[PDB]
Amino acid sequence: CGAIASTVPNYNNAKLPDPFTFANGTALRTKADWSCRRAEISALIQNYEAGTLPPKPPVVTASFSKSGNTGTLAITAGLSNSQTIKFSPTISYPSGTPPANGWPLIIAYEGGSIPIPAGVATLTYSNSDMAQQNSASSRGQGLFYQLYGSTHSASAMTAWVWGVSRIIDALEMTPTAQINTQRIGVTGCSRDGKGALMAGAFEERIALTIPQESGSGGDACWRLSKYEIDNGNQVQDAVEIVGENVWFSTNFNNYVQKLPTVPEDHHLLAAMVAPRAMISFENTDYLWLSPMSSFGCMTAAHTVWQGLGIADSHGFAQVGGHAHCAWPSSLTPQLNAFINRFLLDQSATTNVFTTNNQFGKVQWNAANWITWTTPTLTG
Numbered sequence: 001c002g003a004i005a006s007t008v009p010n011y012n013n014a015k016l017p018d019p020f021t022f023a024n025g026t027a028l029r030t031k032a033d034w035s036c037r038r039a040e041i042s043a044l045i046q047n048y049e050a051g052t053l054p055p056k057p058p059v060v061t062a063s064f065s066k067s068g069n070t071g072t073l074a075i076t077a078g079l080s081n082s083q084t085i086k087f088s089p090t091i092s093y094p095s096g097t098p099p100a101n102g103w104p105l106i107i108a109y110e111g112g113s114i115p116i117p118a119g120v121a122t123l124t125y126s127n128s129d130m131a132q133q134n135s136a137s138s139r140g141q142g143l144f145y146q147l148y149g150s151t152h153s154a155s156a157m158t159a160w161v162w163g164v165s166r167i168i169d170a171l172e173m174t175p176t177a178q179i180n181t182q183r184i185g186v187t188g189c190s191r192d193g194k195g196a197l198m199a200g201a202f203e204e205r206i207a208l209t210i211p212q213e214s215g216s217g218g219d220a221c222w223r224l225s226k227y228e229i230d231n232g233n234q235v236q237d238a239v240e241i242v243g244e245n246v247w248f249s250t251n252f253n254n255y256v257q258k259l260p261t262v263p264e265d266h267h268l269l270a271a272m273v274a275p276r277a278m279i280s281f282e283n284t285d286y287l288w289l290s291p292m293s294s295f296g297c298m299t300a301a302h303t304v305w306q307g308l309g310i311a312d313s314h315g316f317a318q319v320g321g322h323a324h325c326a327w328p329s330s331l332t333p334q335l336n337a338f339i340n341r342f343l344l345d346q347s348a349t350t351n352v353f354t355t356n357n358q359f360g361k362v363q364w365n366a367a368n369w370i371t372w373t374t375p376t377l378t379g
């Protein structure tokens with residue numbers, strides 16, 4: 001891919017950054033080009049809003065034990081300077097004999113808030129232990145920072161991603177966990193839905209990503225939410241979110257008032273999942289979630305899957321009429337379709353892209369935000 005850009009000093013675009021053009025002005029043309037564009041997007045997101053995602057450390061070990069239907073995966077991670085941390089997620093297993101290749105698994109941030117089908121194991125990930133997230137007071141606290149240092153630039157969500165990567169490393173080394181590491185999904189609701197999106201985007205071994213009501217800093221776009229808040233919708237936005245918690249790097253503070261200068265938005269974050277599968281779910285009852293911004297953000301991200309000829313690997317379903325993080329039974333068929341196809345190997349059709357258009361004081365106008373023509377990427 002060559003030397004990937006992590007900063008674009010002269011960038012200034014009030015509309016959504018174009019997925020299909022590299023920072024240097026080179027247009028994407030092949031499906032393989034998307035791998036390099038994803039890597040550039042990774043670098044840009046880390047530089048502007050997420051902080052640094054460390055690579056696998058040189059020590060990662062794991063032991064496993066099981067009591068009844070609950071496994072405990074005891075992980076240790078260590079740096080070359082001997083510093084180490086440990087954490088022990090648990091796994092809830094279906095009973096009986098697993099498939100020949102092991103159970104498909106969903107890594108659920110603090111248990112998630114989706115119903116998980118019977119043939120799928122659930123790993124409960126205590127992401128708040130990995131990086132605290134009470135308020136701005138939490139900056140640099142959590143197991144991640146006991147390894148890398150409390151001034152490490154990673155946001156809380158980037159630290160969470162790191163923990164997921166170590167979990168998957170551990171599973172690959174632990175046959176007795178009886179997990180099919182080729183069929184791992186990730187989910188989370190609300191602030192943990194923001195986290196699940198980051199995990200699926202940055203950790204390519206995740207086969208299915210399921211963010212639930214993730215809102216601002218999740219599947220909503222910064223630029224669209226600024227439009228909402230300026231027009232009287234009481235949405236969460238970039239300016240408020242960096243003061244509320246530590247889900248983003250301290251450096252993001254330098255850009256929340258200057259969003260057009262940021263050469264990325266969360267449509268590119270979501271597009272990092274491609275060519276893997278993702279369906280996110282949103283709720284128009286809570287303007288805090290920035291409903292129009294999520295629909296426009298994911299509509300923009302969808303063009304990447306469309307350009308790759310795999311539109312049905314990316315879903316979006318947005319409805320109203322239920323409490324925050326309550327699962328409406330009306331969406332269970334859509335959720336199960338993605339789980340069935342991408343984790344359970346069924347021939348389920350996954351064409352899901354729906355909203356009720358309940359956006360409050362604004363509307364979605366694609367011509368005001370998307371300026372690119374989706375190319376047909378070759379090869």
Ligand SMILES: *[C@@H]1O[C@H](CO)[C@@H](O)[C@H](O)[C@H]1NC(C)=O
Nearest residue numbers: 001002003004022024026036
């Ligand atoms: C532009 O940047 C991309 C990503 O680093 C790279 O693959 C491509 O070769 C660059 N274009 C030129 C002409 O070097």
Ligand SMILES: *[C@H]1O[C@H](CO)[C@@H](O)[C@H](O)[C@@H]1O
Nearest residue numbers: 003004005006007043047
């Ligand atoms: C982001 O990272 C790139 C390398 O990918 C640097 O060149 C840049 O200065 C910034 O540190």
Ligand SMILES: *[C@H]1O[C@H](CO)[C@@H](O)[C@H](O)[C@@H]1O
Nearest residue numbers: 006007008009010047048
């Ligand atoms: C990209 O990022 C660098 C810092 O890494 C800035 O100096 C530059 O102006 C652009 O924001």
